[PDB]
Ligand binder design. Structure first.
Ligand SMILES: *[C@@H]1O[C@H](CO)[C@@H](O[C@@H]2O[C@H](CO)[C@@H](O)[C@H](O)[C@H]2NC(C)=O)[C@H](O)[C@H]1NC(C)=O
Ligand SMILES: *[C@@H]1O[C@H](CO)[C@@H](O[C@@H]2O[C@H](CO)[C@@H](O)[C@H](O)[C@H]2NC(C)=O)[C@H](O)[C@H]1NC(C)=O
Ligand SMILES: *[C@@H]1O[C@H](CO)[C@@H](O[C@@H]2O[C@H](CO)[C@@H](O)[C@H](O)[C@H]2NC(C)=O)[C@H](O)[C@H]1NC(C)=O
Ligand SMILES: *[C@@H]1O[C@H](CO)[C@@H](O[C@@H]2O[C@H](CO)[C@@H](O)[C@H](O)[C@H]2NC(C)=O)[C@H](O)[C@H]1NC(C)=O
Ligand SMILES: *[C@@H]1O[C@H](CO)[C@@H](O[C@@H]2O[C@H](CO)[C@@H](O)[C@H](O)[C@H]2NC(C)=O)[C@H](O)[C@H]1NC(C)=O
Ligand SMILES: *[C@@H]1O[C@H](CO)[C@@H](O[C@@H]2O[C@H](CO)[C@@H](O)[C@H](O)[C@H]2NC(C)=O)[C@H](O)[C@H]1NC(C)=O
Ligand SMILES: *[C@@H]1O[C@H](CO)[C@@H](O[C@@H]2O[C@H](CO)[C@@H](O)[C@H](O)[C@H]2NC(C)=O)[C@H](O)[C@H]1NC(C)=O
Ligand SMILES: *[C@@H]1O[C@H](CO)[C@@H](O)[C@H](O)[C@H]1NC(C)=O
Ligand SMILES: *[C@@H]1O[C@H](CO)[C@@H](O)[C@H](O)[C@H]1NC(C)=O
Ligand SMILES: *[C@@H]1O[C@H](CO)[C@@H](O)[C@H](O)[C@H]1NC(C)=O
Ligand SMILES: *[C@@H]1O[C@H](CO)[C@@H](O)[C@H](O)[C@H]1NC(C)=O
Ligand SMILES: *[C@@H]1O[C@H](CO)[C@@H](O)[C@H](O)[C@H]1NC(C)=O
Ligand SMILES: *[C@@H]1O[C@H](CO)[C@@H](O)[C@H](O)[C@H]1NC(C)=O
Ligand SMILES: *[C@@H]1O[C@H](CO)[C@@H](O)[C@H](O)[C@H]1NC(C)=O
Ligand SMILES: *[C@@H]1O[C@H](CO)[C@@H](O)[C@H](O)[C@H]1NC(C)=O
Ligand SMILES: *[C@@H]1O[C@H](CO)[C@@H](O)[C@H](O)[C@H]1NC(C)=O
Ligand SMILES: *[C@@H]1O[C@H](CO)[C@@H](O)[C@H](O)[C@H]1NC(C)=O
Ligand SMILES: *[C@@H]1O[C@H](CO)[C@@H](O)[C@H](O)[C@H]1NC(C)=O
Ligand SMILES: *[C@@H]1O[C@H](CO)[C@@H](O)[C@H](O)[C@H]1NC(C)=O
Lengths: 972, 195, 86, 48
């Protein structure tokens, strides 16, 4: 039965010391939560398979297990390792010892050596005959069942026993709960602690959550949805089909021919319509050499050909080297030339006994032309001549063009299975796919079809002349929806772009969703899934899925004579955070690519300016970052300072001005923001030109200038102005009469101070507020870490270590390995620099936007809607931040409203009166005029409206009276 | 061949509902839902204020209301006829769709190139050559195909940056033209902007 | 005023007999404002100034012949190049 | 900047990229096709 075995069965995959690192390796490991056989040693000692290596663990109290035996038959017929542990002297022998019928313990050797509370775990594996021993000693206190915990096994001993181990056996003492696990080629992430001991591991194939952890290379997974793998169905059986032809190829008439033709008049025989069994030719020992240029020597048993030609002639031994593309001589150029793209192989052997008896019958003189003082010359072959002997050479020309085959090997066919994923082999063409019937009317002469990508589309079965389409076996993406591991270990799996067929089931348009309960009640969606569906973790707890809400429904009570005008207001402050600059990196081409290697540098010199042009690009980036900072901050010609007495009309700014008591005159808010944001390969970091103190001085000057002079320092010279009138004019600029400011000045000041306090609480409690800057810092650190890690890649060389390649190969091969490493590292540098250029362009655009907002928002007043936050803009205050700027936007937001009746015009004596500013309102009995953005009823008079035209044109005019202020002045 | 397309999060029905809500808000409340909450206002006074915003006295609107309404309706008929008769109107979107289709088709077509190998088909390479030569042919094909992917990705990043700039301009125009009234010359079309 | 920037607030220049000097860069003359709740500075006359703003508009319309560049007047090079497609 | 970019592109023809010679006519005049395809492929890759 399964138990919560967790992470048992992990051993050190190699002999490399590592610490404080997560290492991904592929080796033979124990599957997590797999079955391990539980054995007893009371009052169960079977022989188990070894496979490719076995993990061993045991718990003892009286040293029951004292020696392992490995072998195949255990019957004295082969060498068998015998280990005995008596006293404190380990003795190892591998002779053919005669064991008793039932081995037990009481309470031709090639390598001899002579010298529950505690579990001693071991790993014994045989690689190419080498017996490798790993072990670990640790105390535990558990007898009843499998121990819970993790323990890694170090290697100590390596015994060269040379036995291929496929089975093993234990020894029980009869008058010891031992454990056996099994290794599999799984990929594991091993975590090494500060002392270099692995304490945990993740099995990348245990389940989708383990797949997510393995993909993201961490033991913690953040909340969200990740795409981790792809589902693919496996084939079940192979199908081998060949034409059922039994004719044999007349190879005897070619290889055992009585006489070969002359090289000037060589024969060209066609072999076709037969089965070519190459096992006879392979088994013949008479051949001296077999060098093939066309096909690999091991593929001739499976592959078969459209045509074979046997070119038969005799050459001189020393000329055997001459039958090759690119070679020259009296043979290659004048009488027998081969194409340089020739496909096939030239096979030759001596024939001294019969071919030479002297033999003067062999005469010599574009590819394959037979051009039948003469140009004709001959050789004198004699039986007493190894090289000068007449070699018999046969050139087999193979046509590999995709066409009907007629000469295929002696392999029996199998039946064909339809509508199943199978591994097929048609005349040497292999692959996996589903073979189905088709309605494509191929012509009788057509054998292969092709797709746009040049892949095979259909084949004609060589036994039954039908056309079968090949459709790749079903596949698709798998997505994992998971909450963070600090909350729960429950996950949901989404099967992408498939229906719930081939795979608590909820059908969506994104795929097959398994594991989430469908809830009809809507809420705002948290973790989006797609196609309008989002998921969240809510309540006993489980994963739920629902259709996202777009907001509360609110119908409009529209009518032609009703207007709502705000009666009260609230002052709100928002925070806008923008990146301004990025780290000024610099890369040393020579030390990075060819670190302290003269030979590598000398080879690098052949590439000219390729890197230094990226060095130029990086210099340009470094300069433009300081240009951006300089342009963003240097908008004030002078450094202004506040008075010692902060008599600012009741507005408290002590929380935004520098604090003189600090070692650096920064404000408390700046301290809060600064308190929230937290090698030898040619990678360096340059300092900025403008220090933090200098930036703080610029921001202090800008703030003091703004408060003491309004917009005058921006427009021209800094002209001092009192803050209450500055505030009144900023209110006037948005269509709100200053008397509202004067009436509510104490409320506005208190609301501002309270909003700032709320900003302090928000910044002190919500870490995500500065994500826009944390993400850029993390991206740059990650890019540099990736560049450094990239040095570990091999790119095809025998070794990734430059000192080990230079220290291992002579120049003629070292230069090749070095050019390969240089090419790979140059591609890595080019990719890095290109990505940096694109990111720099994005940062530059952001900096230009920040400068525009700075200039058109702090120095003046913006009339652009939503340019400086939602609401009616008043002013902004800059604050510095690491690699960025934060704006505090003060906005006017209507708070309370009443439903009022309105009218387009008022008639007096038949004249139509229209408002200069504002709207007409009625409280139900009398008509009033008030400003659109603030309820402030005033009497409708002739000084608010003007006369144009008459009442008979305008639709919707209402009857009223218009007061003339002069009338009572002349009446009284 | 491993090339798939993901669905958008916001469906066409939801986008239509958002545009309907925005249009109903604009028509019933002018700029007030943009500044704060959606507060109802009659259309004739909204039009008078739109006239005041461009330096044209509202009395012209009120005196000429019947003709203005007839010209507005005739203009709307003109938009209907223009959209029903001018096919080139959607070229700006047709070219982007065509560019994405061309990029995907060229990426698929690239599989037919040899890059120096004896054959473009991997299964015939494996079925004909022993591993000691197969590693060379396969890494060469891998290098070529990886370079093709890298070129595709770079072009996609540059086009994405251009689309981002266009989207930012569209959002700025939406915010400063539909919810309010623009005094910026030729920012929201030629003439004195109303709505 | 900063002339040749060095870093970390330090700039260098060639000044006086002449020699290379290093100094802390100036941010401008210091000028405090005599701020009070009853003081305003108002300009009485003005000057009209003209400034020049220069912006790039276009760049050279280059065209590159890949075949002539890579395989100039070489039939064999052209035949090998033909295998790289688009 | 545009003049410098074009001058660098022209100068790039002088680089060898590992071949026995940077000059195409001496490559073609000295090597048989069976090695010429390799040398030409190397130059094509570098120039592309
Ligand atoms: C590994 O050891 C196994 C075990 O003896 C060897 O396999 C045996 O080979 C004989 C000879 O044909 C067969 O009759 C047996 O059936 C095989 N044993 C089993 C369990 O199947 C194998 O040859 C060895 N391999 C190497 C590489 O040493
Ligand atoms: C192969 O074809 C070539 C032409 O492609 C033939 O060349 C002729 O050779 C004879 C004698 O050398 C000349 O008199 C002719 O002028 C050549 N050209 C033509 C068109 O006849 C050559 O003879 C052919 N060889 C064989 C064996 O068929
Ligand atoms: C506008 O709303 C504000 C609150 O948002 C009101 O301020 C409160 O007014 C009540 C009424 O007397 C007092 O009890 C509170 O002391 C006020 N709060 C603060 C923080 O001052 C304000 O009165 C409203 N304006 C009008 C005209 O009613
Ligand atoms: C202006 O704001 C400051 C900062 O909140 C106020 O000083 C705080 O309150 C008392 C004053 O009685 C100080 O002793 C505290 O140390 C200050 N708090 C903190 C957290 O430092 C100051 O009173 C305010 N002044 C006016 C006129 O409103
Ligand atoms: C609507 O406003 C009008 C004018 O402010 C109110 O009419 C005045 O009511 C007061 C009652 O306190 C009287 O002293 C005045 O004589 C009225 N004005 C006139 C011109 O007669 C009216 O009461 C308000 N509507 C409601 C429902 O209260
Ligand atoms: C304002 O006053 C009168 C009735 O109180 C109306 O004005 C007249 O309306 C009749 C009916 O259409 C016309 O024949 C006259 O030409 C109008 N006279 C004037 C001087 O305009 C009018 O209907 C009233 N307004 C409302 C909204 O009821
Ligand atoms: C406005 O101030 C300017 C300051 O430049 C005055 O310019 C000069 O003023 C002096 C004073 O008499 C004259 O001698 C010059 O003729 C003026 N300059 C020029 C170019 O004419 C200017 O006079 C002042 N204007 C007034 C009306 O007082
Ligand atoms: C593991 O052992 C249990 C013992 O009851 C058995 O039921 C189960 O089938 C085994 N696992 C597998 C994969 O066979
Ligand atoms: C145990 O004692 C026997 C006694 O003869 C001895 O031969 C043997 O070597 C001892 N075991 C070991 C492992 O040395
Ligand atoms: C020991 O090995 C030899 C081979 O040198 C073999 O002839 C002999 O039979 C083997 N004897 C035993 C007991 O294994
Ligand atoms: C690592 O070794 C040091 C040596 O003193 C020890 O103090 C520390 O506890 C060890 N760490 C672990 C995780 O065992
Ligand atoms: C050639 O002759 C040998 C001698 O008996 C025979 O074994 C072999 O099968 C023959 N093969 C061919 C290809 O001629
Ligand atoms: C064997 O090949 C012949 C040749 O055409 C064909 O008629 C027949 O179908 C094949 N046999 C089978 C079992 O398909
Ligand atoms: C998750 O739990 C860890 C516990 O160390 C905590 O530090 C972290 O803030 C938590 N994250 C969330 C999103 O709750
Ligand atoms: C199942 O899903 C497929 C898409 O994968 C869809 O085409 C098909 O119509 C679905 N089946 C039913 C019965 O809706
Ligand atoms: C709507 O909610 C009810 C609640 O009982 C549920 O039974 C029903 O299946 C839901 N319908 C849909 C379409 O989700
Ligand atoms: C005013 O009308 C709105 C709808 O336009 C309605 O929601 C609200 O309740 C009304 N308020 C009063 C006081 O009648
Ligand atoms: C509002 O519409 C009603 C219904 O047609 C109409 O009777 C009334 O005169 C209109 N009032 C205004 C002010 O437009
Ligand atoms: C005028 O006021 C400014 C700033 O308030 C001050 O610097 C200057 O000295 C004052 N000049 C006179 C003449 O009062």
């Amino acid at each position: 039965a399964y138990t919560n075995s967790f992470t048992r069965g992990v051993y050190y995959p190699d002999k490399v010391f590592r610490s404080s690192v997560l290492h991904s390796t592929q080796d033979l490991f124990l599957p997590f939560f797999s079955n391990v056989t539980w054995f007893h040693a009371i009052h169960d000692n079977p022989v188990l398979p070894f496979n490719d290596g076995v993990y061993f663990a045991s718990t003892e109290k009286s040293n029951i297990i004292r020696g392992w035996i490995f072998g195949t038959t255990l019957d004295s017929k082969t060498q068998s390792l015998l280990i005995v542990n008596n006293a404190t002297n380990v003795v190892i022998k591998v002779c053919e010892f005669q064991f008793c019928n039932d081995p037990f313990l009481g309470v031709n050797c090639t390598f001899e050596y002579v010298s529950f509370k505690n579990l001693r775990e071991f790993v014994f594996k045989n690689i190419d005959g080498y017996f490798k021993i790993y072990s670990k000693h640790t105390p535990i206190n558990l007898v009843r069942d499998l121990p819970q915990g993790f323990s890694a096994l170090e290697p100590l001993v390596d015994l060269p026993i040379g036995i291929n181990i496929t089975r093993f056996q234990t020894l029980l003492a009869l008058h010891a709960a031992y454990y056996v696990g099994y290794l599999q080629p799984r990929t594991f992430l091993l975590k090494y602690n500060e002392n270099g001991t692995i304490t945990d591991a993740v099995d990348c194939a245990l389940d989708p959550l383990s797949e997510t952890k393995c993909t993201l290379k961490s033991f913690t997974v953040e909340k969200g949805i990740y795409q981790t793998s792809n589902f693919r169905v496996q084939p079940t059986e192979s199908i081998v089909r060949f034409p059922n032809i039994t004719n044999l190829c007349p190879f005897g008439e070619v290889f055992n021919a009585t006489r070969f033709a002359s090289v000037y008049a060589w024969n060209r025989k066609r072999i076709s319509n037969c089965v070519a069994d190459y096992s006879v030719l392979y088994n013949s020992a008479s051949f001296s050499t077999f060098k093939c240029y066309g096909v690999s020597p091991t593929k001739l048993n499976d592959l078969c050909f459209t045509n074979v030609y046997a070119d038969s002639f005799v050459i001189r031994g020393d000329e055997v080297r001459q039958i090759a593309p690119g070679q020259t001589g009296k043979i290659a150029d004048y009488n027998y030339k081969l194409p340089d793209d020739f496909t096939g192989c030239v096979i030759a052997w001596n024939s001294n006994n019969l071919d030479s008896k002297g033999n003067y019958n062999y005469l010599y003189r574009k590819p394959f032309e037979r051009d039948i003082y003469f140009p004709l010359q001959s050789y004198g072959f004699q039986p007493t001549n190894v090289g000068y002997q007449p070699y018999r050479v046969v050139v087999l020309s193979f046509e590999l063009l995709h066409a009907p085959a007629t000469v295929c090997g002696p392999k029996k066919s199998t039946n064909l299975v339809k509508n199943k994923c199978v591994n097929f082999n048609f005349n040497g063409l292999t692959g996996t796919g589903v073979l189905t019937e088709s309605n494509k009317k191929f012509l009788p002469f057509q054998q292969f079809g092709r797709d746009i990508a040049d892949t095979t589309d259909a084949v004609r079965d060589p036994q039954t002349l039908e056309i079968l389409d090949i459709t790749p076996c079903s596949f698709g993406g798998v997505s994992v929806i998971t909450p963070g591991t600090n909350t729960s270990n429950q996950v949901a799996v989404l099967y992408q772009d498939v229906n719930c067929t081939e795979v608590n089931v909820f059908q969506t348009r994104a795929g097959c969703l398994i594991g989430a309960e469908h809830v009809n009640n809507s809420y705002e969606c948290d973790i989006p899934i797609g196609a309008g569906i989002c998921a969240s973790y809510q309540t006993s707890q489980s994963i739920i899925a629902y259709t996202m809400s777009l907001g509360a429904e609110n119908s409009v009570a529209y009518s032609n004579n009703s207007i709502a005008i705000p009666t009260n207001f609230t002052i709100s402050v928002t925070t806008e955070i923008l990146p301004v600059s990025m780290t000024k990196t610099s890369v040393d081409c020579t030390m990075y690519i060819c670190g302290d290697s003269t030979e590598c540098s000398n080879l690098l010199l052949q590439y000219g300016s390729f890197c230094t042009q990226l060095n130029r690009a990086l210099t340009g980036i470094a300069v433009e970052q300081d240009k951006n900072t300089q342009e963003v901050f240097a908008q004030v010609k002078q450094i202004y300072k506040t008075p010692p007495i902060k008599d600012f009309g009741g507005f408290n700014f002590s929380q935004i001005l520098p604090d003189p008591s600090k070692p650096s005159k920064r404000s408390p808010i700046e301290d809060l923001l600064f308190n929230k944001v937290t090698k030898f390969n040619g990678l360096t970091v340059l300092p900025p030109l403008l220090t933090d103190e200098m930036i703080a001085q610029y921001t202090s000057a800008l703030l003091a200038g703004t408060i003491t002079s309004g917009w005058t320092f921006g427009a021209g010279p800094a002209l001092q102005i009192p803050f209450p009138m500055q505030m009144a004019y900023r209110f006037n600029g948005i269509g709100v009469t200053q008397n509202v400011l004067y009436e509510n000045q104490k409320l506005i000041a208190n609301q501002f101070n309270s909003a700032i306090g709320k900003i302090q609480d928000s910044l002190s409690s919500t870490p995500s507020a500065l994500g826009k800057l944390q993400d850029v810092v993390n991206q740059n650190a990650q890019a540099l870490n990736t560049l450094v890690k990239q040095l570990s890649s091999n790119f095809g060389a025998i070794s990734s270590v430059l000192n080990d390649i230079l220290s291992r190969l002579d120049p003629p091969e070292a230069e090749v390995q070095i050019d390969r490493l240089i090419t790979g590292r140059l591609q890595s540098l080019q990719t890095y620099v290109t990505q940096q250029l694109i990111r720099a362009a994005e940062i530059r655009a952001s900096a230009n936007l920040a400068a525009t907002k700075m200039s058109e928002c702090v120095l003046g007043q913006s009339k652009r809607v939503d340019f400086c936050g939602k609401g009616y803009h008043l002013m902004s205050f800059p604050q510095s931040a690491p690699h960025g700027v934060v704006f505090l936007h003060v906005t006017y937001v209507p708070a309370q409203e009443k439903n009022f009746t309105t009218a387009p015009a008022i008639c007096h004596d038949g004249k139509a009166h229209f408002p200069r500013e504002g709207v007409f309102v009625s409280n139900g009995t009398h008509w009033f005029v008030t400003q659109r953005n603030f309820y402030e009823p005033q009497i409708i008079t002739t000084d608010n409206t003007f006369v144009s035209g008459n009442c008979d044109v305008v639709i919707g005019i209402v009857n009223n009276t218009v007061y003339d202020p002069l009338q009572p002045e002349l009446d009284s």
